[PDB]
Amino acid sequence: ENLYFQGMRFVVALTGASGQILGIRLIEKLTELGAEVYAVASRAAKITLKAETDYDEGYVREIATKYYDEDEIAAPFASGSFRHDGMAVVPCSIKTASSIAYGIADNLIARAADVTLKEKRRLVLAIREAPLHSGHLKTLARLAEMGAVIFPPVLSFYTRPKSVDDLIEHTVSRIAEQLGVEVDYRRWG
Amino acid sequence: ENLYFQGMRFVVALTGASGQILGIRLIEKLTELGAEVYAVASRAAKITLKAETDYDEGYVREIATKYYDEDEIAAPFASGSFRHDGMAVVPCSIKTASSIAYGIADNLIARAADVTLKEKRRLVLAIREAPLHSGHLKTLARLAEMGAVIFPPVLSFYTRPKSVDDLIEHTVSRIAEQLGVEVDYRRWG
Amino acid sequence: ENLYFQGMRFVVALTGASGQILGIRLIEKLTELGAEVYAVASRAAKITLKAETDYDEGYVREIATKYYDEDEIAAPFASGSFRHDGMAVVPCSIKTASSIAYGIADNLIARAADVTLKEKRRLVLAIREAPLHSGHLKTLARLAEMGAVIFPPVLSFYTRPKSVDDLIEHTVSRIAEQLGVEVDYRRWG
Amino acid sequence: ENLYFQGMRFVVALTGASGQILGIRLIEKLTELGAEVYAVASRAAKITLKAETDYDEGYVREIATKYYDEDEIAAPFASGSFRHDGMAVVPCSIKTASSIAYGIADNLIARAADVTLKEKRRLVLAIREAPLHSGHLKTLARLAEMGAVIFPPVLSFYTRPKSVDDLIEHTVSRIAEQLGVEVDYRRWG
Amino acid sequence: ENLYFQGMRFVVALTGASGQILGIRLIEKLTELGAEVYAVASRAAKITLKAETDYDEGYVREIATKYYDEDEIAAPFASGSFRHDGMAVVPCSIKTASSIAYGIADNLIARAADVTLKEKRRLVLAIREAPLHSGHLKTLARLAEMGAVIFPPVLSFYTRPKSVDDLIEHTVSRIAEQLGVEVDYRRWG
Amino acid sequence: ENLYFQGMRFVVALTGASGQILGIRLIEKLTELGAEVYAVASRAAKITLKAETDYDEGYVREIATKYYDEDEIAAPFASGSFRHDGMAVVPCSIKTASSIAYGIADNLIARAADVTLKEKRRLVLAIREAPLHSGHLKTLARLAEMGAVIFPPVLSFYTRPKSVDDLIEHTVSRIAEQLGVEVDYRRWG
Amino acid sequence: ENLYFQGMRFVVALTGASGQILGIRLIEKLTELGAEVYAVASRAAKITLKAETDYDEGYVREIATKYYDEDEIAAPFASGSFRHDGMAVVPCSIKTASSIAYGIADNLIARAADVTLKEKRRLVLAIREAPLHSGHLKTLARLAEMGAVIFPPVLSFYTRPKSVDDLIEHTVSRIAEQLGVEVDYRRWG
Amino acid sequence: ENLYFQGMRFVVALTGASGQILGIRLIEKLTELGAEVYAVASRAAKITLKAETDYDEGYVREIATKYYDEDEIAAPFASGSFRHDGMAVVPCSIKTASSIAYGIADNLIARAADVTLKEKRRLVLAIREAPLHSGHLKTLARLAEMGAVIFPPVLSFYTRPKSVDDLIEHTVSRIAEQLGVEVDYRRWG
Amino acid sequence: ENLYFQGMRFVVALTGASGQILGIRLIEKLTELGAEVYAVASRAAKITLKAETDYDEGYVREIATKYYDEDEIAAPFASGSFRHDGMAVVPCSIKTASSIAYGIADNLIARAADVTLKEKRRLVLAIREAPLHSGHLKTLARLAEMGAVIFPPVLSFYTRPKSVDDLIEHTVSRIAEQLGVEVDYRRWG
């Protein structure tokens, strides 16, 4: 659609929080619109996928432009000299959000996110946990100060959703807008 | 069920964030289990109810034990000497979360929440906004330091939800647990 | 007495905290001593007056030099170019203290207090709440840093009070001293 | 009444702030309701008692379950291994509040309060001073962060008090509620 | 004894700090008193056990109600919806204390502790290191702000210990009291 | 041994925390190795010595090179112009740690420690308390920022201790190493 | 001279820092100019006077308008209701500066200074210590935020001093100017 | 040269940042001068060595006095009781710098560095990343507060370098000076 | 005396604060004891020398080992690779203290001091100003955190000084001790 003309490419990482379908649908949306997606899924994300979905273990690799596991710490986007247009961690665990906040860049996901931030590229973190305690909130404040977009994947009813897929589509569209993507979807305005 | 034997009573306030159904279902759940619910809905919550639901304007007053509008600043739970077992603001707007954080206690909802906090009673805030920027996060950190439970009403898939109502039931059950209620529902453990 | 020779004039505002009699008696004291008092009472202060006293709704307007309601946001002392010798908010609610602290200057009382502070004139806040939680205390610290006098209207027994009016007289005299007024009363020294 | 069935026991300490009668009446109230009270009065509290009351120097020892002077630094509740249900310092001087805040635990009162806090037992401080300056407020914020209840013994008029004893009864009842005591008294609700 | 009547269950985790015997004895104590103990031992804790004790590698699994290794990140208490009465990390390394403080929830121990904290359940950390430098102290302050009990397992002589086992019994009893357990042992009061 | 050749001299102070034997054994160790020890014991330390040991009240004075009581505020090491090689407070109460942190230098122990710090000499504080709450931790952070060594006297099992004296020897040796003393003892390396 | 016409009265306290002559000369200067001086000397100040001067122990009492010892905690200026024009602590120890900063108001000097500050009267602290470490500096910053004048009694040579008394006269004159006194002395302008 | 006479021994760790040659040359320099070097290389450092050099995988083990892999968490210098003269992490990744800062001491390198810091031994971190964002800078500030030397391995031209090896020699010499080594090299003075 | 055997060399800088004689006497003392002194005097220090002394404009250059003016920004000790044993700024103006604190290293004095600090060499700042306001105190706190010794050149009377030169000798001796110099002088101990 409107992402191949400028030839966009995004990093999308899935981590071990509930909501694997959100990252899968975001990858599907971005590639449909003509962007390249470099995808990574952590070991805990693969465990969560099995726990809460019926997706095949290879589906993310199949729909991505290029696929990396989390120990591929020499992947191209582990260096700031590799150009890309934004990274999303969807869904984002506390563990990965915190690893990014504090620089515990011990796998490809945290390192790629740190590289995204240091180069002042867009980073969107769909951080799923509730409640959030004071330590979580201090971590999210630090991430916001570092430039990350903090996007709790909250329930939203103002678009009159009728199915689970309706909720997923709204949240995925909203996350895509944080990457600079001008997605078409049902807005309040 | 297990809330009339100790004769629990809770304050539940609805504010002008998306997710009116979450507060309505929480009231329905708490009263079914035998607790008294003193309910309040802000003017913006009434506007949101009309925008995103088909509920009658009088439904919350009908299902509550006692109902107050937001300008009833002399309601019983506006004083710390009135005993109750916890307050939930569901859904909670940034405006009401921030008013509580900083003491702008200019209506019954913010005052009742401030009274809840100063008496070290339980306060649960189902704060719905995304993204959250650094000012939001500093406000939520302040609320957490004041003792509030910060509960973004996030999408949750580990209970294999099949309908919108499934998601609402999970989130409402989880919020109820933050009030000390031992609700029966589908848990990960 | 000793306030007309220099022709003092003070702003006294009553807000919706318990202790309306403290502000009424402060106005009575300041005018007896020959100062002009520009008075304002909030809507919640009028409600509290009815709840806890037998005072007529017009008494404050009757005893003041000039009277304003809280929506008179163009009153003379809403601008820093109007000269006066100090403002007291007695009693002061958390809502009004916090509105001043954080600049939510949405009525005449909060704006007049902000104007008092920015011009480095004396502002005394008789803040009545107990307990005070950590958010309250951070707000009061901010007000103190901005230059306000923080005067919780505490019980005081060292003057051997024999009636409620004895306690009111001590506290009102002490608040008056924070305005620079050399009131005559029973001191420890 | 409702404190012997669970066999409650509280520590009540009186310090050298005005309002000795508040601590005396709190001890009287707690023992009437069937709790044990372990009482301590500082040397400055004994001086204040003589200055502002006609109480005998031995009255607190007479009404307490067990009495300690402030240099009894080996009293049972100086160790966290001694069980009790809460401590109140009523009235609480700036000196004792600050000693607790900063760990200057140089007498039984400050040590017992520090032990109360480190064991996450309830501590209520009826801190009497006005004005409070920025150093006081930073100290009270620290105490609140450590878990203490900060209860300035403010004038309260919403129960229509007709005598000094009416004010004392309200404030003492409210302080008792901060210890978890379900006292019977005239409430706003 | 007094923990089966309410059917208590606790999480006890052992990490790679010196003092493995403290966690083993805590498990033994809690189960003797009739509580269920869900135990976890990290890989470094197993190494320390071999270095400083003669315990069999399977003893903790034998005495626990249910046993998990640290990579069992889908254990029941990894979700806040699983009910339990408190978690203790005994002994607690700097690595695990810090992982909890900052949200590096990369194994079952840190995740279970984070879940304990976000649900405002009791968490006791028997943090063993000396000296503690300024970074350690900032971490422990953050944990305390998040609600954890910070229990350095210090030498204690006021119970006149005559053997190493006497010291272990005192410290284990004191840690148990931080879980709300009313253990019987030799107290100063 | 290796402390008389450079003619070392240390200040060792005992305060009213449990673990008097730790300070006694540290004095014995330092003098055996040929250093001079200027010792001080607070009044609360003398009370603790009687409570938890069978030591004579004069033993510390007997084993020290020179002995001072805590009110000897003009002792030589109360001035920075007196040269010495380090001070240890063993055991160190919260009261004395906090007095040093905040400058409440009201006896010889706190003043000597403040003089040690301002001259950038070594100060080691064997701070014994558990739990430590957030106020304690903020105090210890301040002390660490001022340059003090923070040494909670924790249980240590990696040297396979078989008696209480084994634990004391390890902890005393470790504290001695913080003074720059190259003590001979059983190390992990 | 120019202090009796408005009938000034000051509190001057001497504490146990070197420079007793500075406080003695300040008292002499203020009374010569016609002000009343209420003087207090701590026990450590009396010890320092004997150590570094030949002054009689009764001289300060002789030259003061009224004299108090430090345990006269009921002196008139221990209450904010007693009027005076400023307090100076000259010389000021770290112990007394810190006691004021943190509210350890355990003698007349610290309490009178706290009362001076809470009433927004002038307080000048001639704080003598060198070096000042980071804890000292944080304390002095807190005092400055509370409104105190921080006056290290530094050597000054721009008035070409020829004797010790010349230095004392300059420093005492400069301290007097911080009390609002328009002393006549040799200025740079 | 001048490091065997006092028999120095250093820990040198290589982590997965660019600049493996800097750590290799530092080891070569320290051993040439007669010090013992205990070396450790992380898994990511071994990957970087292969990516950017032609060094054999066994070279670091060959030139070191003793060699450890990063999972040897029981190596001698993992305990503070093992004596050494300083540790350098050269080059130092953000991941390892941050792990040290925040106490995520999950391998030998981070633990050895934490042990170095808690014993107030010298730690030099040759932290290589650019840009550094605000989270990195807050981490480096924390490390500096903990006592670490923060040494970005910057280009330096004032010694007129003519080859890459000239730059390496300057930077390695400068890092060696931070360990207290008096290396001979071309200085500006 | 005891500074040539190890061949000490110090940087001594004079800035435009009163007390030029303190720096002159420090240079004289250090060279008498056999150290080399590299001296620098700012333009404002030369102006102050003329204003308050009769010293020739060339005296500092005459007594120094090597002399530099403040614009000699390429002097040897402007680089960290030049070895020296400590720097003193005596007397130190607010301008130069603040320039060092905040890195405004725009002349040789501020740069040499910054180089001293970054190499963790000793820096002593004889900061002369009174009063010190909150901005000064925040600056001095920052300098202390950076490792500088903060030495206000305060009047000291405990050595019974009889002349101005007696005071200078005490203060200069004390400053010399902060450089690690074991000067012989009249001490309290």
Ligand SMILES: Cc1cc2nc3c(=O)[nH]c(=O)nc-3n(C[C@H](O)[C@H](O)[C@H](O)COP(=O)(O)O)c2cc1C
């Ligand atoms: C079924 C399941 C669901 C989980 N959901 C969350 C979650 O929603 N949020 C979270 O912070 N952690 C969650 N966790 C725990 C994380 O998976 C765990 O912290 C893991 O170490 C994260 O690692 P990663 O960020 O590298 O994928 C979940 C674990 C499981 C087994």
Ligand SMILES: Cc1cc2nc3c(=O)[nH]c(=O)nc-3n(C[C@H](O)[C@H](O)[C@H](O)COP(=O)(O)O)c2cc1C
């Ligand atoms: C349809 C609709 C949906 C809204 N949803 C949110 C929301 O989800 N979160 C939020 O902070 N504000 C939301 N707002 C804006 C708030 O209603 C607005 O800030 C209002 O002043 C809140 O007032 P209240 O907290 O007193 O109800 C919404 C407004 C409308 C009209």
Ligand SMILES: Cc1cc2nc3c(=O)[nH]c(=O)nc-3n(C[C@H](O)[C@H](O)[C@H](O)COP(=O)(O)O)c2cc1C
């Ligand atoms: C009878 C009554 C007494 C009240 N007392 C207090 C009080 O003492 N302190 C307080 O913060 N709020 C008190 N409130 C709540 C305030 O009136 C409420 O926050 C209001 O919005 C304050 O608005 P105002 O500051 O503009 O007058 C009271 C309310 C009522 C009805």
Ligand SMILES: Cc1cc2nc3c(=O)[nH]c(=O)nc-3n(C[C@H](O)[C@H](O)[C@H](O)COP(=O)(O)O)c2cc1C
């Ligand atoms: C008559 C009298 C009343 C006092 N009232 C107060 C007070 O209300 N608040 C306060 O902080 N100090 C007050 N003080 C001063 C304290 O008694 C003084 O700070 C004392 O050291 C407190 O010690 P304590 O806390 O150990 O009892 C009063 C003193 C006197 C003589």
Ligand SMILES: Cc1cc2nc3c(=O)[nH]c(=O)nc-3n(C[C@H](O)[C@H](O)[C@H](O)COP(=O)(O)O)c2cc1C
């Ligand atoms: C014998 C031995 C004893 C140890 N003792 C401690 C200790 O007391 N405190 C600490 O923080 N680390 C200690 N460590 C290091 C930790 O085991 C190391 O940081 C490890 O990564 C902790 O991981 P864990 O918390 O997941 O068990 C010790 C290591 C060994 C081999």
Ligand SMILES: Cc1cc2nc3c(=O)[nH]c(=O)nc-3n(C[C@H](O)[C@H](O)[C@H](O)COP(=O)(O)O)c2cc1C
């Ligand atoms: C038997 C006994 C043991 C004590 N143990 C401790 C302790 O371990 N830690 C502590 O902070 N205070 C302890 N205290 C309380 C202190 O002794 C008390 O705070 C005292 O004022 C400390 O004063 P000092 O530091 O001047 O010796 C103990 C008191 C007693 C009677």
Ligand SMILES: Cc1cc2nc3c(=O)[nH]c(=O)nc-3n(C[C@H](O)[C@H](O)[C@H](O)COP(=O)(O)O)c2cc1C
């Ligand atoms: C001769 C002598 C001189 C002293 N000089 C100082 C000093 O200059 N600054 C300081 O902080 N303490 C000094 N002290 C220590 C204080 O006197 C000690 O901290 C005392 O407790 C202060 O108590 P005060 O403030 O109540 O007088 C000195 C002590 C002595 C014996």
Ligand SMILES: Cc1cc2nc3c(=O)[nH]c(=O)nc-3n(C[C@H](O)[C@H](O)[C@H](O)COP(=O)(O)O)c2cc1C
């Ligand atoms: C070729 C290569 C070069 C790297 N360079 C750096 C670097 O210069 N700085 C950095 O922080 N991370 C760098 N990384 C990423 C780290 O290796 C990664 O964060 C790793 O987890 C660090 O682990 P370690 O500190 O345990 O060695 C690099 C990775 C690769 C593959």
Ligand SMILES: Cc1cc2nc3c(=O)[nH]c(=O)nc-3n(C[C@H](O)[C@H](O)[C@H](O)COP(=O)(O)O)c2cc1C
């Ligand atoms: C006679 C005289 C004395 C001065 N004394 C001081 C002083 O004691 N403290 C201070 O901060 N500034 C003092 N100043 C002002 C400084 O000289 C001025 O801030 C100057 O810019 C400092 O520059 P420098 O640090 O590079 O020498 C004095 C100025 C003059 C003319």
